[PDB]
Amino acid sequence: ESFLYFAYGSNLLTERIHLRNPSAAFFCVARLQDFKLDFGNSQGKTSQTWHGGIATIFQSPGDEVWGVVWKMNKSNLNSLDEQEGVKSGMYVVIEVKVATQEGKEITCRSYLMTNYESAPPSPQYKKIICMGAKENGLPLEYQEKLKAIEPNDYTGKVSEEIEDIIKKG
Amino acid sequence: EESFLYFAYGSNLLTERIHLRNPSAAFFCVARLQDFKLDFGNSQGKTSQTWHGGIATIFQSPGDEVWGVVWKMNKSNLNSLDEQEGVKSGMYVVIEVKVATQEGKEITCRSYLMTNYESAPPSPQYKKIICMGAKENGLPLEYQEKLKAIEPNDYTGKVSEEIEDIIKK
Fold first, then answer.
1. In angstroms, rounded to a whole number, what is the distance separating the alpha carbons of residues A124 and A122?
2. CA-CA distance, B102 to B10, in Å (whole number)?
3. Which residues in chain B touch residue A57, judged by CB atoms under 8 angstroms apart?
4. What family, per the record (chain A)?
């Protein structure tokens, strides 16, 4: 009756995932080996939510990505696909096998872009990813990699709910 | 359940090909993936030493379509098929897609695509297999025309005796 979702983007942050998925439950932190984090514009179009590149991953040996695994009810599948832009061609659904820090492999659903042009993330998007990694105790080493991601020069505003999340943190 | 559904769009269109690593695979139906374009590429910039040209992949692209075959397989087969597509070595990533049959029924399948590749044309031997299976498994004739119109590379050496034998006849 449930599935596991691997989040490496803005759904690292508990407050953020719950906005549209309030029943999501923290399962654990995990590592996707041989993938690399990237940001970009789907179909070459800038996200009008985030106003910068949005998170995605691709196979890259030697590389890793840390994320948070959420447990969700199977009734939320279509909604999460809808959230991630699957019908509109923004992400594709993937199955990945991630590793917990005590050596356990977990099989999860996640999402990645197949057709994007690489592009830096907006500060607010960066900040949401940073807060989520810290909230959920991703490794400090990984957090520093995130802190070092150069953002674009967007100086306007995102949605008030996001903009208010940031003011709290 | 006991079973899962797999959507082949490359060399596993051919029954004789799929059956050599997955003998219990059974034909389910022919189906269409919307807003996806077929391509051929070298994963990680490595040429297939099996096929000696670009091997098949898909990416999201509104407007276009990819036709293929849905195979029904035992869920005991899962790991095997992953090994076959080199998931662990970063050659393909596992995806979920929804496909429509010619009578309009939507199906949820497993498939694969490449996340990190250079575009490269397929070998003549590979194109044949793909065409042989498009034909044998009743893919629509206009789509067969599209496959037939693929420009192969100039490779005219030996492939594996098993692949060369399938082709002869």
1. 6
2. 19
3. 115
4. Belongs to the gamma-glutamylcyclotransferase family.
Which ranges of A18-149 would DSSP assign to H, the alpha helix?
Answer: 77-83, 123-135, 140-147
Give the CA-trace dihedral at A131, A137, A138, A139, to 10 degrees. 120
> Considering its fold, how many domains does chain B have in total?
1
Which domain range does residue B124 map to?
1-169
In this structure, is the dihedral angle defined by the CA atoms of residues A43, A47, A52 and A53, taken in order, positive or negative? Answer: negative
**H or E element, residue B83:** helix B78-84
**Rounded CA gap, B43 and A24, in Å?**
35
CA distance A130 to A9: 9
Solved with: X-ray
Task: Work out whether the CA dihedral A3, A6, A12, A16 comes out positive or negative.
Answer: negative
- Tell me the CATH number at A109: 3.10.490.10
- The reply to whether A118 touches chain B by the CB within 8 Å rule is no
The alpha-carbon gap from A145 to the nearest alpha carbon of chain B, in Å, equals 22
